[PDB]
PDB file of all heavy atoms in Angstrom:
ATOM      1  N   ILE A   1     -68.595-120.132 -99.326  1.00 51.60           N
ATOM      2  CA  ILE A   1     -69.426-121.023 -98.595  1.00 51.60           C
ATOM      3  C   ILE A   1     -68.548-121.817 -97.568  1.00 51.60           C
ATOM      4  O   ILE A   1     -68.976-122.044 -96.392  1.00 51.60           O
ATOM      5  CB  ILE A   1     -70.055-122.030 -99.533  1.00 51.60           C
ATOM      6  CG1 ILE A   1     -70.805-121.311-100.750  1.00 51.60           C
ATOM      7  CG2 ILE A   1     -71.177-122.912 -98.825  1.00 51.60           C
ATOM      8  CD1 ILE A   1     -71.782-122.184-101.479  1.00 51.60           C
ATOM      9  N   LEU A   2     -67.434-122.206 -97.900  1.00 50.41           N
ATOM     10  CA  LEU A   2     -66.585-123.149 -97.051  1.00 50.41           C
ATOM     11  C   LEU A   2     -65.873-122.498 -95.934  1.00 50.41           C
ATOM     12  O   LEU A   2     -65.509-123.163 -94.959  1.00 50.41           O
ATOM     13  CB  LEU A   2     -65.532-123.888 -97.951  1.00 50.41           C
ATOM     14  CG  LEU A   2     -66.132-124.854 -98.799  1.00 50.41           C
ATOM     15  CD1 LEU A   2     -64.965-125.558 -99.591  1.00 50.41           C
ATOM     16  CD2 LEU A   2     -66.908-125.884 -98.214  1.00 50.41           C
ATOM     17  N   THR A   3     -65.754-121.168 -95.919  1.00 50.60           N
ATOM     18  CA  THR A   3     -65.087-120.590 -94.746  1.00 50.60           C
ATOM     19  C   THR A   3     -66.039-120.765 -93.592  1.00 50.60           C
ATOM     20  O   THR A   3     -65.646-121.205 -92.506  1.00 50.60           O
ATOM     21  CB  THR A   3     -64.783-119.124 -94.983  1.00 50.60           C
ATOM     22  OG1 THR A   3     -66.064-118.547 -95.105  1.00 50.60           O
ATOM     23  CG2 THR A   3     -64.034-118.900 -96.339  1.00 50.60           C
ATOM     24  N   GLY A   4     -67.273-120.408 -93.815  1.00 50.88           N
ATOM     25  CA  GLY A   4     -68.325-120.643 -92.827  1.00 50.88           C
ATOM     26  C   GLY A   4     -68.547-119.249 -92.032  1.00 50.88           C
ATOM     27  O   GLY A   4     -69.413-119.278 -91.069  1.00 50.88           O
ATOM     28  N   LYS A   5     -67.617-118.338 -92.254  1.00 48.38           N
ATOM     29  CA  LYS A   5     -67.646-116.950 -91.740  1.00 48.38           C
ATOM     30  C   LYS A   5     -68.651-116.301 -92.743  1.00 48.38           C
ATOM     31  O   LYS A   5     -69.303-115.412 -92.318  1.00 48.38           O
ATOM     32  CB  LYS A   5     -66.339-116.379 -91.759  1.00 48.38           C
ATOM     33  CG  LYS A   5     -65.187-117.157 -91.308  1.00 48.38           C
ATOM     34  CD  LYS A   5     -65.594-118.355 -90.435  1.00 48.38           C
ATOM     35  CE  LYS A   5     -64.486-119.284 -90.169  1.00 48.38           C
ATOM     36  NZ  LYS A   5     -64.871-120.373 -89.176  1.00 48.38           N
ATOM     37  N   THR A   6     -68.701-116.797 -93.982  1.00 48.27           N
ATOM     38  CA  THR A   6     -69.746-116.319 -94.944  1.00 48.27           C
ATOM     39  C   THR A   6     -70.932-117.222 -94.737  1.00 48.27           C
ATOM     40  O   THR A   6     -70.920-118.357 -95.118  1.00 48.27           O
ATOM     41  CB  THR A   6     -69.290-116.425 -96.333  1.00 48.27           C
ATOM     42  OG1 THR A   6     -68.065-115.640 -96.468  1.00 48.27           O
ATOM     43  CG2 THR A   6     -70.298-115.970 -97.340  1.00 48.27           C
ATOM     44  N   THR A   7     -72.002-116.558 -94.124  1.00 49.40           N
ATOM     45  CA  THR A   7     -73.232-117.215 -93.711  1.00 49.40           C
ATOM     46  C   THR A   7     -74.436-116.708 -94.592  1.00 49.40           C
ATOM     47  O   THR A   7     -75.559-116.882 -94.147  1.00 49.40           O
ATOM     48  CB  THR A   7     -73.513-117.112 -92.295  1.00 49.40           C
ATOM     49  OG1 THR A   7     -74.171-115.850 -92.074  1.00 49.40           O
ATOM     50  CG2 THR A   7     -72.174-116.978 -91.552  1.00 49.40           C
ATOM     51  N   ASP A   8     -74.157-116.071 -95.756  1.00 50.92           N
ATOM     52  CA  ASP A   8     -75.253-115.583 -96.563  1.00 50.92           C
ATOM     53  C   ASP A   8     -76.070-116.771 -97.050  1.00 50.92           C
ATOM     54  O   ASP A   8     -77.257-116.636 -97.191  1.00 50.92           O
ATOM     55  CB  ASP A   8     -74.627-114.926 -97.816  1.00 50.92           C
ATOM     56  CG  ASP A   8     -74.026-113.524 -97.461  1.00 50.92           C
ATOM     57  OD1 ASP A   8     -74.792-112.604 -96.964  1.00 50.92           O
ATOM     58  OD2 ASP A   8     -72.812-113.336 -97.594  1.00 50.92           O
ATOM     59  N   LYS A   9     -75.435-117.973 -97.244  1.00 54.19           N
ATOM     60  CA  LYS A   9     -76.156-119.223 -97.123  1.00 54.19           C
ATOM     61  C   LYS A   9     -75.104-120.250 -96.735  1.00 54.19           C
ATOM     62  O   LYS A   9     -74.063-120.336 -97.360  1.00 54.19           O
ATOM     63  CB  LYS A   9     -76.761-119.659 -98.456  1.00 54.19           C
ATOM     64  CG  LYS A   9     -78.237-119.971 -98.386  1.00 54.19           C
ATOM     65  CD  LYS A   9     -79.001-119.945 -99.664  1.00 54.19           C
ATOM     66  CE  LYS A   9     -80.451-120.205 -99.660  1.00 54.19           C
ATOM     67  NZ  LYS A   9     -81.206-119.787-100.981  1.00 54.19           N
ATOM     68  N   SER A  10     -75.402-120.990 -95.615  1.00 54.06           N
ATOM     69  CA  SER A  10     -74.421-122.009 -95.185  1.00 54.06           C
ATOM     70  C   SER A  10     -74.944-123.414 -95.439  1.00 54.06           C
ATOM     71  O   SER A  10     -76.194-123.578 -95.597  1.00 54.06           O
ATOM     72  CB  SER A  10     -74.111-121.835 -93.680  1.00 54.06           C
ATOM     73  OG  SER A  10     -73.011-121.036 -93.488  1.00 54.06           O
ATOM     74  N   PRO A  11     -74.084-124.365 -95.566  1.00 54.10           N
ATOM     75  CA  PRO A  11     -74.537-125.695 -96.066  1.00 54.10           C
ATOM     76  C   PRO A  11     -74.985-126.571 -94.879  1.00 54.10           C
ATOM     77  O   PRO A  11     -74.293-126.628 -93.875  1.00 54.10           O
ATOM     78  CB  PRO A  11     -73.293-126.317 -96.694  1.00 54.10           C
ATOM     79  CG  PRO A  11     -72.216-125.738 -95.955  1.00 54.10           C
ATOM     80  CD  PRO A  11     -72.583-124.316 -95.482  1.00 54.10           C
ATOM     81  N   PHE A  12     -76.122-127.318 -95.164  1.00 52.19           N
ATOM     82  CA  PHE A  12     -76.378-128.515 -94.288  1.00 52.19           C
ATOM     83  C   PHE A  12     -75.289-129.428 -94.468  1.00 52.19           C
ATOM     84  O   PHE A  12     -74.862-129.672 -95.638  1.00 52.19           O
ATOM     85  CB  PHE A  12     -77.677-129.149 -94.599  1.00 52.19           C
ATOM     86  CG  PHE A  12     -78.055-130.180 -93.578  1.00 52.19           C
ATOM     87  CD1 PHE A  12     -79.141-129.883 -92.711  1.00 52.19           C
ATOM     88  CD2 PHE A  12     -77.511-131.375 -93.477  1.00 52.19           C
ATOM     89  CE1 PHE A  12     -79.471-130.786 -91.801  1.00 52.19           C
ATOM     90  CE2 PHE A  12     -77.890-132.191 -92.550  1.00 52.19           C
ATOM     91  CZ  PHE A  12     -78.826-132.009 -91.669  1.00 52.19           C
ATOM     92  N   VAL A  13     -74.825-129.935 -93.345  1.00 53.99           N
ATOM     93  CA  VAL A  13     -73.632-130.897 -93.393  1.00 53.99           C
ATOM     94  C   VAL A  13     -74.204-132.302 -93.124  1.00 53.99           C
ATOM     95  O   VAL A  13     -74.791-132.553 -92.086  1.00 53.99           O
ATOM     96  CB  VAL A  13     -72.637-130.509 -92.307  1.00 53.99           C
ATOM     97  CG1 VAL A  13     -71.684-131.712 -91.958  1.00 53.99           C
ATOM     98  CG2 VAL A  13     -71.798-129.249 -92.825  1.00 53.99           C
ATOM     99  N   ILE A  14     -74.020-133.223 -94.221  1.00 50.73           N
ATOM    100  CA  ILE A  14     -74.262-134.599 -94.004  1.00 50.73           C
ATOM    101  C   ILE A  14     -73.085-135.356 -93.510  1.00 50.73           C
ATOM    102  O   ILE A  14     -72.005-135.122 -93.941  1.00 50.73           O
ATOM    103  CB  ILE A  14     -74.793-135.199 -95.348  1.00 50.73           C
ATOM    104  CG1 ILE A  14     -75.975-134.456 -95.951  1.00 50.73           C
ATOM    105  CG2 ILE A  14     -75.281-136.633 -95.107  1.00 50.73           C
ATOM    106  CD1 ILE A  14     -76.787-135.175 -96.919  1.00 50.73           C
ATOM    107  N   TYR A  15     -73.211-136.192 -92.410  1.00 52.25           N
ATOM    108  CA  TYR A  15     -72.036-136.758 -91.853  1.00 52.25           C
ATOM    109  C   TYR A  15     -72.333-138.226 -91.421  1.00 52.25           C
ATOM    110  O   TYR A  15     -71.396-138.943 -91.133  1.00 52.25           O
ATOM    111  CB  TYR A  15     -71.505-135.909 -90.669  1.00 52.25           C
ATOM    112  CG  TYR A  15     -72.467-135.610 -89.563  1.00 52.25           C
ATOM    113  CD1 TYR A  15     -72.259-135.957 -88.339  1.00 52.25           C
ATOM    114  CD2 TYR A  15     -73.690-134.892 -89.784  1.00 52.25           C
ATOM    115  CE1 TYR A  15     -73.107-135.698 -87.211  1.00 52.25           C
ATOM    116  CE2 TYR A  15     -74.572-134.751 -88.800  1.00 52.25           C
ATOM    117  CZ  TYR A  15     -74.293-135.075 -87.582  1.00 52.25           C
ATOM    118  OH  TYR A  15     -75.116-134.875 -86.572  1.00 52.25           O
ATOM    119  N   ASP A  16     -73.512-138.532 -91.413  1.00 52.11           N
ATOM    120  CA  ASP A  16     -74.078-139.864 -91.057  1.00 52.11           C
ATOM    121  C   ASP A  16     -75.382-140.132 -91.693  1.00 52.11           C
ATOM    122  O   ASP A  16     -75.842-139.368 -92.473  1.00 52.11           O
ATOM    123  CB  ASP A  16     -74.296-139.963 -89.494  1.00 52.11           C
ATOM    124  CG  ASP A  16     -75.391-138.973 -89.015  1.00 52.11           C
ATOM    125  OD1 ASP A  16     -76.449-139.111 -89.402  1.00 52.11           O
ATOM    126  OD2 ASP A  16     -75.029-138.169 -88.200  1.00 52.11           O
ATOM    127  N   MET A  17     -75.948-141.324 -91.348  1.00 51.53           N
ATOM    128  CA  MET A  17     -77.306-141.594 -91.886  1.00 51.53           C
ATOM    129  C   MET A  17     -78.345-140.667 -91.440  1.00 51.53           C
ATOM    130  O   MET A  17     -79.367-140.445 -92.108  1.00 51.53           O
ATOM    131  CB  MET A  17     -77.705-143.054 -91.615  1.00 51.53           C
ATOM    132  CG  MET A  17     -76.425-144.088 -91.701  1.00 51.53           C
ATOM    133  SD  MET A  17     -76.036-144.442 -93.456  1.00 51.53           S
ATOM    134  CE  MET A  17     -77.490-145.204 -93.985  1.00 51.53           C
ATOM    135  N   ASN A  18     -78.304-140.076 -90.272  1.00 53.94           N
ATOM    136  CA  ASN A  18     -79.354-139.248 -89.737  1.00 53.94           C
ATOM    137  C   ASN A  18     -79.323-137.910 -90.337  1.00 53.94           C
ATOM    138  O   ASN A  18     -80.459-137.295 -90.606  1.00 53.94           O
ATOM    139  CB  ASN A  18     -79.411-139.214 -88.206  1.00 53.94           C
ATOM    140  CG  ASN A  18     -80.747-139.340 -87.609  1.00 53.94           C
ATOM    141  OD1 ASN A  18     -81.608-139.923 -88.263  1.00 53.94           O
ATOM    142  ND2 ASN A  18     -80.906-138.810 -86.386  1.00 53.94           N
ATOM    143  N   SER A  19     -78.191-137.431 -90.733  1.00 52.59           N
ATOM    144  CA  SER A  19     -78.103-136.136 -91.518  1.00 52.59           C
ATOM    145  C   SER A  19     -78.679-136.340 -92.925  1.00 52.59           C
ATOM    146  O   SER A  19     -79.319-135.500 -93.496  1.00 52.59           O
ATOM    147  CB  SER A  19     -76.698-135.612 -91.565  1.00 52.59           C
ATOM    148  OG  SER A  19     -75.817-136.699 -91.647  1.00 52.59           O
ATOM    149  N   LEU A  20     -78.264-137.555 -93.490  1.00 51.86           N
ATOM    150  CA  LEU A  20     -78.882-137.813 -94.787  1.00 51.86           C
ATOM    151  C   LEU A  20     -80.377-137.830 -94.824  1.00 51.86           C
ATOM    152  O   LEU A  20     -80.971-137.233 -95.743  1.00 51.86           O
ATOM    153  CB  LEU A  20     -78.382-139.213 -95.234  1.00 51.86           C
ATOM    154  CG  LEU A  20     -78.986-139.820 -96.411  1.00 51.86           C
ATOM    155  CD1 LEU A  20     -78.133-139.189 -97.667  1.00 51.86           C
ATOM    156  CD2 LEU A  20     -78.889-141.287 -96.481  1.00 51.86           C
ATOM    157  N   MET A  21     -81.008-138.397 -93.822  1.00 51.91           N
ATOM    158  CA  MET A  21     -82.458-138.218 -93.587  1.00 51.91           C
ATOM    159  C   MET A  21     -82.879-136.736 -93.688  1.00 51.91           C
ATOM    160  O   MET A  21     -83.728-136.317 -94.516  1.00 51.91           O
ATOM    161  CB  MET A  21     -82.859-138.712 -92.187  1.00 51.91           C
ATOM    162  CG  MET A  21     -82.268-139.983 -91.677  1.00 51.91           C
ATOM    163  SD  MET A  21     -82.933-141.627 -92.034  1.00 51.91           S
ATOM    164  CE  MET A  21     -81.791-142.233 -93.364  1.00 51.91           C
ATOM    165  N   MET A  22     -82.274-135.851 -92.851  1.00 55.08           N
ATOM    166  CA  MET A  22     -82.582-134.446 -92.847  1.00 55.08           C
ATOM    167  C   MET A  22     -82.079-133.847 -94.187  1.00 55.08           C
ATOM    168  O   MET A  22     -82.758-132.897 -94.771  1.00 55.08           O
ATOM    169  CB  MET A  22     -81.923-133.812 -91.701  1.00 55.08           C
ATOM    170  CG  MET A  22     -82.513-134.243 -90.304  1.00 55.08           C
ATOM    171  SD  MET A  22     -84.230-133.724 -89.891  1.00 55.08           S
ATOM    172  CE  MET A  22     -83.726-132.198 -88.913  1.00 55.08           C
ATOM    173  N   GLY A  23     -80.950-134.277 -94.681  1.00 52.94           N
ATOM    174  CA  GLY A  23     -80.342-133.700 -95.798  1.00 52.94           C
ATOM    175  C   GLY A  23     -81.329-133.768 -97.094  1.00 52.94           C
ATOM    176  O   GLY A  23     -81.047-133.102 -98.091  1.00 52.94           O
ATOM    177  N   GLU A  24     -82.393-134.536 -96.871  1.00 53.57           N
ATOM    178  CA  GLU A  24     -83.426-134.364 -97.920  1.00 53.57           C
ATOM    179  C   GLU A  24     -84.698-133.639 -97.440  1.00 53.57           C
ATOM    180  O   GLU A  24     -85.379-133.155 -98.340  1.00 53.57           O
ATOM    181  CB  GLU A  24     -83.773-135.811 -98.505  1.00 53.57           C
ATOM    182  CG  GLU A  24     -84.267-135.763 -99.867  1.00 53.57           C
ATOM    183  CD  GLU A  24     -85.268-136.786-100.115  1.00 53.57           C
ATOM    184  OE1 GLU A  24     -85.849-137.200 -99.108  1.00 53.57           O
ATOM    185  OE2 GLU A  24     -85.487-137.206-101.265  1.00 53.57           O
ATOM    186  N   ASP A  25     -84.927-133.527 -96.162  1.00 50.75           N
ATOM    187  CA  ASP A  25     -85.998-132.658 -95.691  1.00 50.75           C
ATOM    188  C   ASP A  25     -85.981-131.328 -96.379  1.00 50.75           C
ATOM    189  O   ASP A  25     -86.986-131.011 -97.030  1.00 50.75           O
ATOM    190  CB  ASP A  25     -85.755-132.471 -94.115  1.00 50.75           C
ATOM    191  CG  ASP A  25     -87.035-132.429 -93.300  1.00 50.75           C
ATOM    192  OD1 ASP A  25     -88.149-132.157 -93.977  1.00 50.75           O
ATOM    193  OD2 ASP A  25     -87.000-132.492 -92.128  1.00 50.75           O
ATOM    194  N   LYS A  26     -84.866-130.584 -96.298  1.00 51.12           N
ATOM    195  CA  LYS A  26     -84.847-129.173 -96.632  1.00 51.12           C
ATOM    196  C   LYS A  26     -83.900-128.864 -97.931  1.00 51.12           C
ATOM    197  O   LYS A  26     -84.080-127.923 -98.484  1.00 51.12           O
ATOM    198  CB  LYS A  26     -84.418-128.295 -95.459  1.00 51.12           C
ATOM    199  CG  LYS A  26     -85.421-128.357 -94.287  1.00 51.12           C
ATOM    200  CD  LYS A  26     -86.909-128.318 -94.597  1.00 51.12           C
ATOM    201  CE  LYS A  26     -87.289-126.971 -95.194  1.00 51.12           C
ATOM    202  NZ  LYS A  26     -88.547-127.066 -96.068  1.00 51.12           N
ATOM    203  N   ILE A  27     -82.907-129.701 -98.161  1.00 50.99           N
ATOM    204  CA  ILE A  27     -82.113-129.599 -99.408  1.00 50.99           C
ATOM    205  C   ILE A  27     -82.885-130.433-100.474  1.00 50.99           C
ATOM    206  O   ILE A  27     -83.115-131.643-100.295  1.00 50.99           O
ATOM    207  CB  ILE A  27     -80.691-130.141 -99.193  1.00 50.99           C
ATOM    208  CG1 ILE A  27     -79.808-129.144 -98.493  1.00 50.99           C
ATOM    209  CG2 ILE A  27     -80.199-130.329-100.695  1.00 50.99           C
ATOM    210  CD1 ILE A  27     -78.375-129.650 -98.582  1.00 50.99           C
ATOM    211  N   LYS A  28     -83.209-129.774-101.535  1.00 53.69           N
ATOM    212  CA  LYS A  28     -83.658-130.394-102.694  1.00 53.69           C
ATOM    213  C   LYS A  28     -82.584-130.790-103.690  1.00 53.69           C
ATOM    214  O   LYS A  28     -81.747-129.926-103.867  1.00 53.69           O
ATOM    215  CB  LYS A  28     -84.806-129.551-103.296  1.00 53.69           C
ATOM    216  CG  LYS A  28     -86.024-129.315-102.427  1.00 53.69           C
ATOM    217  CD  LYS A  28     -87.064-128.547-103.112  1.00 53.69           C
ATOM    218  CE  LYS A  28     -88.297-128.155-102.168  1.00 53.69           C
ATOM    219  NZ  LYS A  28     -89.194-127.102-102.739  1.00 53.69           N
ATOM    220  N   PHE A  29     -82.690-131.895-104.289  1.00 55.06           N
ATOM    221  CA  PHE A  29     -81.804-132.331-105.435  1.00 55.06           C
ATOM    222  C   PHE A  29     -82.735-132.678-106.547  1.00 55.06           C
ATOM    223  O   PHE A  29     -83.985-132.925-106.253  1.00 55.06           O
ATOM    224  CB  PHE A  29     -81.028-133.558-105.032  1.00 55.06           C
ATOM    225  CG  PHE A  29     -80.679-133.766-103.599  1.00 55.06           C
ATOM    226  CD1 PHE A  29     -81.304-134.935-102.967  1.00 55.06           C
ATOM    227  CD2 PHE A  29     -79.746-133.164-102.878  1.00 55.06           C
ATOM    228  CE1 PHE A  29     -80.996-135.138-101.595  1.00 55.06           C
ATOM    229  CE2 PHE A  29     -79.387-133.397-101.609  1.00 55.06           C
ATOM    230  CZ  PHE A  29     -79.992-134.422-101.024  1.00 55.06           C
ATOM    231  N   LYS A  30     -82.321-132.952-107.791  1.00 56.54           N
ATOM    232  CA  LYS A  30     -83.258-133.443-108.716  1.00 56.54           C
ATOM    233  C   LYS A  30     -83.504-134.936-108.451  1.00 56.54           C
ATOM    234  O   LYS A  30     -83.060-135.771-109.194  1.00 56.54           O
ATOM    235  CB  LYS A  30     -82.883-133.215-110.249  1.00 56.54           C
ATOM    236  CG  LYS A  30     -84.051-132.672-111.008  1.00 56.54           C
ATOM    237  CD  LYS A  30     -83.615-132.054-112.422  1.00 56.54           C
ATOM    238  CE  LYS A  30     -83.454-130.454-112.235  1.00 56.54           C
ATOM    239  NZ  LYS A  30     -82.019-130.141-112.164  1.00 56.54           N
TER     240      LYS A  30
END
């Protein structure tokens, strides 16, 4: 996952409050 050259599934990157907003749009957590 971390190389990023492997894109079979790549991670949404949270880096500020606005990614955190989106970070729950499409990433589900319990």
Side-chain angles (χ1 to χ4, degrees):
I1 312 198
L2 290 181
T3 68
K5 319 336 169 173
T6 300
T7 88
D8 290 300
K9 231 162 187 170
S10 266
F12 190 104
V13 160
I14 304 197
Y15 55 123
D16 60 61
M17 319 286 297
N18 224 24
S19 38
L20 173 83
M21 318 276 99
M22 296 287 266
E24 206 214 25
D25 214 345
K26 302 314 292 158
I27 284 190
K28 297 181 183 168
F29 335 110
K30 219 159 276 104

